[PDB]
């Protein structure tokens, strides 16, 4: 007898909402989107992602009719090929939670629909300030925090795209170089669906922000303590991986021993990622349209949907 804005699901029940939804993705292509540590198999794609894709594609149609209503109020025509208001999806979660993978997968699944939609993916890491300006603000120790990103630029970019611009541009970020790529840019030209993935993308504030432009939002959740381990394991793993390359802004880590590294990583987590996570990311979870709850083994076996 107690109504709720949320609907809780166990994967076993959620998996049934897939219905006819075809699986237009392969085992190959899947590993080509898989992220370091993420153990996502086709089964999870069919049981978790496909239902989500169906939910989203049902929403896109209706949400665009809603904007069209306002356009009709403004005496504004739907000139040219009815260029519907792009549908914006936000994907957030902690560092090392798996959100990068989630978004790449969602883009693929969402893209492979019979009416062939234009689906773009944009990570907000490209809106982080170059390291230079990052120190001119004494924020190199807070990289990842809301402040470390150019929120006005990010808001403009998304506002321009949802506004109907023929095109808009974003910077590009280099994870190896740990910094923005000079002159490098990412162009987005009037997509049917735009997905924005990043740490604080769901953050709120005194002024309208990108979170206020999302038509749907995804939050990748995990036991805080479980993510710490994922982060470390990935740290160590990366020693013999990305770091190795001398061009790694962190090559000085490759030489670390299991112990040393784990010690270094754990500290970084305690001083930067955990705080940002707790102070800025978690707080947004309640308003996310859909929460993907992962177990210590990376498997998403539980979800929380906002039906209201």
Q: Which does 183 bind (CB under 5 to 8 A by kind): ligand COK, a second copy, none?
A: none
- CA torsion, ordered 189, 194, 198, 200, to nearest 10 deg: 100
Interface with ligand COK, residue 144, by CB under 6 A: yes
- Count of beta carbons in the 10 Å neighbourhood of residue 87: 25
Contact mark string toward a second copy, 279..298, x via CB under 8 A: ----x--xx-----------
How many whole angstroms separate alpha carbon 266 and alpha carbon 96? 13
Long-range pairs for 135-141 at CB < 8 Å and ≥24 separation?
A: 141/271, 141/272
What would the x/- binding string for ligand COK be over residues 151 to 190, using CB under 6 A?
A: ------------------------xx-x------------
Spatial separation of the C-alpha atoms in residues 209 and 93, rounded to whole Å:
17
Instruction: At 108, give phi and psi (nearest 5°).
Output: -60, -55
Query: Interface mask (CB under 6 A) for ligand COK, residues 236-255, using x and -?
Result: ------x-------x-----
Question: Alpha helix locations (H) across the chain?
Answer: 11-14, 27-31, 42-44, 50-73, 99-111, 131-135, 151-163, 224-238, 258-268, 274-276
Select from 130-138, 141-149, 156-164, 217-225 the region that touches a second copy (CB under 8 A).
156-164
Among 84, 86, 90, 198, the residue binding ligand COK under the rule CB under 6 A is 198
Query: Is there a contact between 261 and 239 (Cβ–Cβ < 8 Å)?
Result: yes
Per-residue DSSP letter, 124: G
The binding track of 260-299 with respect to ligand COK, each residue x by CB under 6 A or -, is --------x---xx--------------------------
Tell me if 299 contacts a second copy by CB under 8 A.
no
Residue 236 has φ and ψ, to the nearest 5°, of -50, -50
Q: How far is the CB of 238 from a second copy (least distance, A)?
A: 35
> Is residue 100 within the footprint of ligand COK (CB under 6 A)?
yes
3-state secondary structure 158-181: HHHHHHCCCCEEEEEEECCCCEEE
Which one of residues 143, 162, 293, 302 is an interface residue with ligand COK (CB under 6 A)? 143
Known binding residue 97? Answer is yes
How far is 143 from 242, CA to CA, in rounded Å? 19
Within a 10 A sphere around the Cβ of 123, how many other Cβ atoms?
23
Rg of the chain taking only CA atoms, in angstroms: 20
Among residues 250 and 256, whose Cβ is nearest to ligand COK? 250
Q: Interaction with ligand COK in 51-70: which residues (CB under 6 A)?
A: none
Residues between 204 and 233 that touch a second copy (CB under 8 A): 204, 206-208, 212-213
- Phi first, then psi: give them for residue 139, nearest 5 degrees: -135, 15
The verdict on 107 binding ligand COK (CB under 6 A) reads no
Name the residues that contact ligand COK, by CB under 6 A. 35-36, 95-96, 100-101, 125, 143-144, 175-176, 178, 198-199, 234-235, 242, 250, 268, 272-273
Question: Which residues line the annotated binding site?
Answer: 93-100
Question: Which residues line the annotated binding site for ATP?
Answer: 93-100
Name the residues that contact a second copy, by CB under 8 A. 2-5, 7, 16-17, 51, 54-55, 58-59, 61-63, 65-70, 72-75, 156, 159-160, 162-163, 165, 204, 206-208, 212-213, 283, 286-287, 306-308
């Amino acid at each position: 007898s107690e109504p709720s804005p949320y609907v809780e699901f166990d994967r076993r029940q959620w998996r049934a909402l897939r219905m006819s939804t075809p699986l237009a993705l392969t085992e190959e292509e899947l590993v080509g989107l898989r992220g370091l540590g993420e153990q996502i198999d086709l089964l999870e794609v069919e049981e978790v992602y496909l239902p989500l894709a169906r939910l989203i594609h049902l929403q896109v149609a209706a949400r665009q009719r809603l904007f069209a209503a306002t356009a009709e109020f403004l005496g504004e025509p739907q000139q040219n090929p009815d260029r519907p208001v792009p549908f914006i999806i936000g994907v957030a979660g902690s560092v090392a939670v798996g959100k990068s993978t989630t978004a790449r997968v969602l883009q693929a699944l969402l893209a492979r629909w019979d009416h062939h939609p234009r689906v773009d993916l944009v990570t907000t890491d490209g809106f982080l300030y170059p390291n230079a300006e990052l120190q001119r603000r004494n924020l190199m120790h807070r990289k990842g925090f809301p402040e470390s990103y150019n929120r006005r630029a990010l808001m403009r970019f998304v506002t321009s795209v949802k506004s109907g611009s023929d095109y808009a541009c974003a910077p590009v970020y280099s994870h190896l170089h740990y910094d923005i790529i000079p002159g490098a840019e990412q162009v987005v030209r009037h997509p049917d669906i735009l997905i924005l993935e990043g740490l604080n993308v769901l953050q709120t504030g005194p002024t309208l922000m990108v979170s206020d432009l999302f038509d749907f939002s995804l939050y990748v959740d995990a036991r805080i303590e479980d993510i710490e381990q994922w982060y470390v394991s990935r740290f160590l793993a990366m020693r013999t991986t990305a770091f190795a390359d001398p061009e790694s802004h962190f090559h000085h880590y490759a030489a670390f021993s299991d112990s040393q590294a784990v010690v270094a990583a754990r500290e970084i987590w305690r001083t930067i990622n955990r705080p940002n996570l707790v102070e800025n990311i978690l707080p947004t979870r309640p308003r996310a349209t859909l929460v993907l709850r992962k177990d210590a083994d990376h498997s998403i076996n539980r979800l929380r949907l906002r039906k209201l």
